Design a protein around this nucleic acid. Structure first.
Lengths: 335, 159, 31, 421, 134
RNA sequence: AAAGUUACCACAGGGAUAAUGGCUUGUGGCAGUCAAGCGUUCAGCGACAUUGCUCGGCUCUUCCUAUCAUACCGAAGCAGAAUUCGGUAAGCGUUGGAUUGUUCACCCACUAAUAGGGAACGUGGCUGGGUAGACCGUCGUGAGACGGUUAGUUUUACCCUACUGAU
RNA sequence: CUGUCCCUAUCUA
RNA sequence: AGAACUGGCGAUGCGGGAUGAACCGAACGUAGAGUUAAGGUGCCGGAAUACACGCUCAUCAGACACAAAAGGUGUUAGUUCAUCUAGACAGCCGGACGGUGGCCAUGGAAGUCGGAAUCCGCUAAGGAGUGUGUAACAACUCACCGGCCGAAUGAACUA
């Protein structure tokens, strides 16, 4: 067993809030420290191994990498945290005066019966001659010692049927807390690209709730996995995302017939080797190593050779419908 | 691995430049380290250290006095007949005893011949017990002075 | 660490042992 | 072993050995019991502790006996060498003392264990155990002198040379103070200075050298003029299969006259006559004819202050001991200069490039820019090798343009006939 | 000695007590596994060998000279499916092994049958006496 | 001619026991000198070294250090390697199969090593080796053999609760 | 020769 | 352990010792006021964080007869002896001799591998030499004295 993981009780919520954030270099440029996403099945990857010393140097190796759907994240507010003897305290919060229907639904448990008066009063007062928002911004700039940004996922841009977004706070690691809120102000109602927070070969640590198992209570507990390298970052509009520099085949990373228990990838996604806690359709948050863990394995780049995108349901001998048609040829139902 | 090279190497190249200083400092600190050990050591280690220090002090005092002297110028065995179930294991039977002569500075290990008078019982004499004070005879009378039951040996002094 | 509590059984045994030792000392006045 | 007994375990003095055994007994075995415990339990506990102490003593004694080599049961050369340094009878008596102590300890342990089981009270068992421990200590205590002697001889034997009499060898003999070790310095790796006083070498020195690829080594001796230092040389000369070289000083050095040296050599002749002797001279020279009366001895007139004849003597000693379609070579190889390791300007090997780049575990050899190509512009090969699930390597070939043109011609000849409709 | 790298945790399917054909001309017919050197002692686990592992075995069949003796053996065939680094899973025809001294020198002048690539790359002497590598 | 004697006195008669007071551990016994000081002045005793022979064996968990390995340090003829002791140190580990006239003597191997114990009738969480209360009476030649009477009681429990989870 | 076991996993009522 | 004698327990509440059968106090009708015992006076706990003379800094001290004979460059108070302006102890500068490398033991030993002598000659005092090392000396150190030096101090024992 492992007494450190006890109690093995149910998680507080599906969204496992991040307990700790990486170091805060107050001189670096403002940037986000975490990103949201949804697990989308898994796939096999074969690539060369540029790793001196290892016997498999200059050799191809088969590996399994998970695929997480990461639609562009949109910022809706910021949180200012002051330092107190009883720990960090949130003194105030602000909003963008405009909230997508997803977050508005997130604030209601019975949406269709609700009057949808989520933020009408606050928005009306926001449209005054200031003095209500600038006051809070100045208060945060003065007293707050650390600033966190509130964002939500674009569920309506996801093939899932949840139709509800999840609020999450992300710490800002870069410039002084005044520069932090100044940068946040320019990003209210804006969207942050997935490739801006992470890049290829970068190591990340995932945090999510694992698959539940019911009475044995087992599963459905929060877990953290560290030292996961990013193999490739793609975009929904970037056709042939599964086309490596070698494969160069105009095929998307989405498996033939769609993912198992999941839809199709038509948005930005992050590819990282190994598995991640949780299952498909589970919301996952991504952190970056919590520290300078830049080992040789992290430092070395991973030049992808081929990406598996065959039919994950059952088995598969072809990666695209064109290959199946060419190999099988014409059929009775074709003509 | 040929000869005394380590001494030869030391002579031809010298010891550490501070080896003598380290030894001198260690010897100087020994005065306080001894006290610290006498005050810090606990348990059996403290007992051993105290005993060793006492022995060293006694030896030093004796050496000083000697220099000053020169400065002037269990039992014993179809033989049983009428004895009841009082069987005596053979392990308790010893045939030889340690005999010492009070008038001579020589001791001889000799067999036990016969028990003369075991105190504390006539039955003890009949059975040949070897309790303390028993008078015995040895093949050259002697009396046992120790308790064989508690040490496994039979020490006797010639009468 | 050792307990400093004065056990009643131990305390009474101490008194009994002290009385026995005093008796022996009184009876040893033969020199 | 037989070469150098450096593996013998240290012989802790009586006080140290007894302390170690008692500490092991007190630590490993339990020591907590009460008068209210079962009588059989207490008896078993005490018997187990006594047996553990006896087993520890027996193991220590057996290890000491086994590690130490039995002088009588060793090679005669090594046997006599040990006898000269350590009196053989004294060493045997010392070993017998350890054996007797071990036997007495075993007997005491067995007798007490047999008696201990009959203890009718805790106090009796404790007294019997204490008596057994006192007997063991007394047995160990009596061994203080033999234990100290064993420790000293162990610490001295480890540094002894690993002489190999069976191998062909040469022995440097002669008078002391004749610079006999100077020849050793200049013929092998050994290091002993002239030291103009005679008895510098209190022990034999050995040095290795190779001639004609055959293994050889030289043994130095203090010299002969009835003492341990001189005595050990006699057995080395006799038992060893090595040839013996006699060193003589043809000068005032060492004070001994040439006549005295020649007379001594003749007097010791009956001992090394069969060793294929040689004489090295480190009216005066007329007496050398008498020395030459032995057919097997030469006269190497020399002086050990330099290498005037050491080079020739090295080969002479070894000789005396032994007496007892066409290929294709590219012009590039013949023209390329040899890689001079000491020259800083030598061609930089992969080792230098790796060192300049980093450690062996971080620098990766790049095969690009090394292999030849038609054009170096695209040296960064990125060969896809896959196309729509098809193996390109199965299609890569030159002059495929003609095949494609033929296929196009076939397509044209089939389409005009209306094959497809 | 003999090894030329660090162990790779391939699938294990040859626990103690297994029998495999002796794939060499040394005259031995089969080898009986008694222990697996270098393995970990788990609770109740039977030491399991694999391709390229050095284990101690006794010749249960063959000429009387090799019978009843114990010598190190190197596994050349496992017959159990295992994941190679080159993507596809593979398994050999049947269990087989060879007998050699701890220094890696094979007792037989030549090995027979296919030889696992992992064992060949880890035991250079085995590859020297091998004729069919995979 | 018999009476005493007998601690083998044996068979019966009768009296009261026998069911940690800090226990426990590494250095013996008897004998002699060496002697802090006490012996009425100190009539006796007496430390340390010294001398003479001399029911085992299963399983999961917790804990102690009197620690086999891992970490650090000092000493040792420590040339290197390896090794021995000592000090801190219980954070993490301490093996897969066989011995059955006392199996505990003890098998052949792996592993860095395969450390010893407590867990109050310590537990069957665990297994079988074990080998089988008393009272009375009859026949009792000095000696054992047949009656008859009887005890076979921590126990189910939807009783208390630490637990692992869940409203 | 067998899931007794290395080492457990799965289905049914 | 045995013989005799005296209390406590019972046929005994109550107060204190945190808690009790062997400890201390204690003459039991229901009530009001004061004075006490053991036991206490920082809080739980009613009472001075009262006064005075000394003592302990303890890596689990301490607040109650036994593993107890000793050690500690851990503190404070003492007994005996001896030196102290003829210069107390300490710190340095010098000397630390001459027979003689005393006599034996030997490849070698001038004091310091070893056996016994450990003598005489001169000195304010200097060994057949206390320790480091050299094959062997050499040098260096104290055993001991003087020069600078400026007052009390050392050894064995008791609390």
């Amino acid at each position: 067993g492992h007494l450190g993981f006890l109690p093995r009780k149910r998680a507080a919520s599906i969204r496992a809030r991040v307990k700790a954030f990486p170091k805060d270099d107050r001189s670096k440029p403002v940037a986000l420290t975490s990103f949201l996403g949804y697990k989308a099945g898994m796939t096999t990857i074969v690539r060369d191994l540029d790793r001196p010393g290892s016997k498999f140097h200059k050799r191809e190796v088969v590996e399994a990498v998970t695929v997480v759907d990461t639609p562009p994240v949109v910022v809706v507010g910021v949180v200012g945290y002051v330092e107190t003897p009883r720990g960090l305290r949130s003194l105030t919060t602000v909003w963008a005066e405009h909230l997508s229907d997803e977050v508005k639904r997130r604030f209601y448990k019975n949406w269709y019966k609700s009057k949808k008066k989520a933020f009408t009063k606050y928005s009306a007062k926001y449209a005054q001659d200031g003095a209500g928002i600038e006051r809070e911004l100045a208060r945060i700039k003065k007293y707050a010692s650390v600033v966190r940004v509130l964002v939500h996922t674009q569920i309506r841009k996801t093939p899932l049927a949840q139709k509800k977004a999840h609020l999450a706070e992300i710490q800002l690691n870069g410039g002084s807390i005044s520069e932090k809120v100044d940068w946040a102000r320019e990003h209210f109602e804006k969207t942050v690209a997935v490739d801006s927070v992470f890049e290829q070969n970068e190591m990340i640590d995932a945090i999510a709730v694992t698959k539940g198992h019911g009475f044995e209570q087992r599963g459905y507990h929060s877990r953290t996995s560290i030292n996961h390298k990013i193999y490739r970052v793609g975009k929904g509009d970037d056709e042939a995302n599964g086309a490596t520099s070698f494969d160069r085949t105009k095929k998307t990373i989405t498996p033939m017939g769609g993912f198992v228990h999941y839809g199709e990838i038509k948005n930005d996604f992050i590819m990282v080797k190994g598995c991640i806690p949780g299952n498909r359709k589970r919301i996952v948050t991504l952190r970056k190593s919590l520290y300078t863990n830049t080992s040789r394995k992290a430092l070395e780049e991973v030049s992808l050779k081929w990406i598996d995108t065959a039919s994950k349901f059952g088995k598969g001998r072809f990666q695209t419908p064109a290959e199946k048609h060419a190999f099988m040829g014409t059929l009775k139902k074709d003509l | 691995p040929q000869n005394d090279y380590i001494e030869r190497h030391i002579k031809q190249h010298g010891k550490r430049l501070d080896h003598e200083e380290r030894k001198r400092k260690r010897e100087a600190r020994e005065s306080h380290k001894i006290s610290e050990r006498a005050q810090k050591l606990t348990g059996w280690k403290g007992k051993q250290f105290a005993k060793k220090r006492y022995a060293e002090k006694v030896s030093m005092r004796k050496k000083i006095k000697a220099h000053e002297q020169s400065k002037v110028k269990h039992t014993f065995v179809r033989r049983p007949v009428k004895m009841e179930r009082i069987i005596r294991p053979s392990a308790l039977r010893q045939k030889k005893a340690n005999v010492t002569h009070p008038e001579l500075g020589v001791t001889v290990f000799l067999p036990i011949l016969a028990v003369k008078k075991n105190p504390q019982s006539p039955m003890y004499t009949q059975l040949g017990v070897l309790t303390k004070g028993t008078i015995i005879e040895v093949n050259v009378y002697a009396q046992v002075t120790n308790e064989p039951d508690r040490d496994g040996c039979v020490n006797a002094v010639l009468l | 660490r050792q307990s400093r509590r004065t056990s009643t059984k131990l305390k009474e045994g101490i008194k009994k042992k002290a009385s026995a030792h005093r008796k022996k000392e009184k009876k040893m006045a033969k020199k | 072993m037989q070469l150098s007994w450096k593996d013998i375990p240290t012989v802790a003095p009586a006080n140290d050995l007894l302390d170690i055994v008692l500490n092991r007994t007190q630590r490993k075995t339990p020591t907590v019991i009460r008068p209210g415990f079962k009588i059989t339990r207490i008896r078993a506990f005490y018997m187990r502790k006594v047996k553990y102490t006896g087993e520890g003593f027996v193991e220590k004694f057996e290890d000491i006996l086994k590690g130490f080599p039995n002088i009588n049961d060793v090679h005669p050369f090594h046997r006599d060498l040990m006898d000269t340094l350590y009196e053989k009878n004294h060493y045997k008596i010392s070993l017998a003392a350890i054996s007797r102590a071990k036997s007495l300890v075993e007997q005491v342990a067995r007798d007490y264990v047999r008696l201990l089981k009959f203890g009718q009270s805790l106090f009796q068992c404790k007294q019997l155990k204490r008596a057994a421990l006192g007997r063991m200590a007394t047995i160990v205590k009596k061994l203080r002198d033999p234990l100290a002697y064993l420790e000293q001889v162990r610490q001295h034997i480890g540094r002894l040379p690993s002489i190999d009499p069976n191998t062909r060898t040469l022995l440097i003999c002669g008078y002391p103070n004749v610079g006999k070790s100077s020849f050793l310095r200049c013929i092998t790796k050994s290091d002993v200075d002239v030291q103009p006083y005679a008895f510098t070498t209190k022990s034999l020195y050995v040095g290795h050298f190779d001639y004609k690829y055959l293994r050889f080594q030289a043994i130095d001796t203090p010299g002969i003029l009835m003492n341990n230092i001189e005595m050990q040389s006699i057995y080395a000369i006799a038992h060893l299969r090595s040839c013996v070289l006699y060193f003589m000083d043809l000068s005032e050095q060492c004070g001994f006259t040439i006549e005295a040296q020649v007379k001594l050599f003749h007097s010791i002749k009956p001992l090394f006559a069969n060793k294929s002797v040689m004489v090295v001279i480190n009216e005066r020279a007329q007496l050398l004819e008498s020395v030459k009366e032995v057919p097997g001895v030469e006269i190497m007139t020399s002086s050990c202050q330099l290498e005037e004849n050491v080079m020739e003597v090295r080969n002479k000693a070894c000789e005396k001991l032994l007496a007892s379609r066409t290929p294709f070579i590219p012009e590039s190889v013949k023209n390329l200069k040899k890689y001079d390791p000491e020259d800083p300007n030598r061609r930089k090997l992969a080792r230098d490039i790796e060192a300049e780049n980093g450690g062996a575990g971080v620098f990766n050899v790049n095969l690009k820019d090394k292999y030849l190509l038609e054009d170096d512009e695209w040296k960064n090969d990125i060969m896809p090798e896959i196309l729509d699930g098809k193996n390109v390597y199965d299609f890569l070939d030159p002059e495929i343009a003609a095949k494609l043109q033929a296929l196009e011609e076939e397509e044209e000849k089939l389409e005009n006939e209306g094959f497809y409709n | 000695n003999g090894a030329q790298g660090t162990k790779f945790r391939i699938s294990l399917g040859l626990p103690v007590g297994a029998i495999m054909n002796c794939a060499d001309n040394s005259g031995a017919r089969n080898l009986y596994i008694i222990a697996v050197k270098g393995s970990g002692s788990r609770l109740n686990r039977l030491p399991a060998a694999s391709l390229g592992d050095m284990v101690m075995a006794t010749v249960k069949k063959g000429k009387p000279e090799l019978r009843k003796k114990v010598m190190p053996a190197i596994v050349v065939r496992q017959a159990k499916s295992w994941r190679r680094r080159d993507g596809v899973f593979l398994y050999f025809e049947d269990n087989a092994g060879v007998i050699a001294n701890p220094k890696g020198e094979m007792k037989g002048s030549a090995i027979t049958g296919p030889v696992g690539k992992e064992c060949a790359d880890l035991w250079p002497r085995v590859a020297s006496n091998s004729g069919v590598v995979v």
